[PDB]
Design a protein around this ligand. Structure first.
Ligand SMILES: c1cnc(NC2CCCCCC2)nc1
Length: 149
């Protein structure tokens, strides 16, 4: 898999995160991110994908050591952590063939796992519109605890 890069954008209170909603296969809510081009540095891909999907330029705010990285089915995803962006910021995708909506969500209300179906004696997981964000939620809460208490 080609690595992906993007951002976890938080507001000034540290309560809220910015998610984006795609279409079709990407029809739920997730962090803004995308696949690296040939020769492109990680920090540059993260600002490019985030600017295409949100209209906000993170390049002046990226810190090189502040990120959460996960490997999911043998594809690496790294999201740079960007705190203190005001909730009244105007966000506007470039690409509205790709992005349906852009919204702030309360971190403490987001799920950090999907629910099973053990009430129906059935295997697997119930559908959840946050499926693409979910793997990052617990590592983000632990990172914010360590760095801010
Ligand atoms: C995990 C997987 N995917 C995504 N975002 C994708 C990229 C386009 C933006 C709409 C959401 C879909 N985030 C985290």
């Amino acid at each position: 898999g080609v690595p992906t890069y993007g951002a976890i954008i938080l507001d000034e209170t540290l309560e809220n995160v910015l998610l984006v909603q795609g279409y079709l296969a990407k029809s739920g809510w997730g962090f803004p991110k995308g696949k690296v081009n040939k020769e492109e540095a990680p920090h540059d891909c993260a600002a490019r994908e985030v600017f295409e999907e949100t209209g906000f330029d993170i390049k002046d705010y990226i810190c090189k050591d502040d990120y959460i990285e996960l490997r999911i089915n043998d594809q690496l995803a790294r999201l740079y952590i960007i705190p203190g962006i005001p909730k009244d910021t105007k966000f506007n995708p470039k690409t509205r063939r790709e992005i349906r909506n852009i919204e702030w969500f309360s971190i403490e209300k987001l799920p950090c796992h999907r629910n099973d179906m053990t009430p129906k004696s059935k295997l697997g997981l119930a559908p959840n519109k946050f499926f693409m964000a979910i793997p990052f939620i617990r590592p983000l809460r632990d990172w914010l605890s360590r760095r801010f208490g």
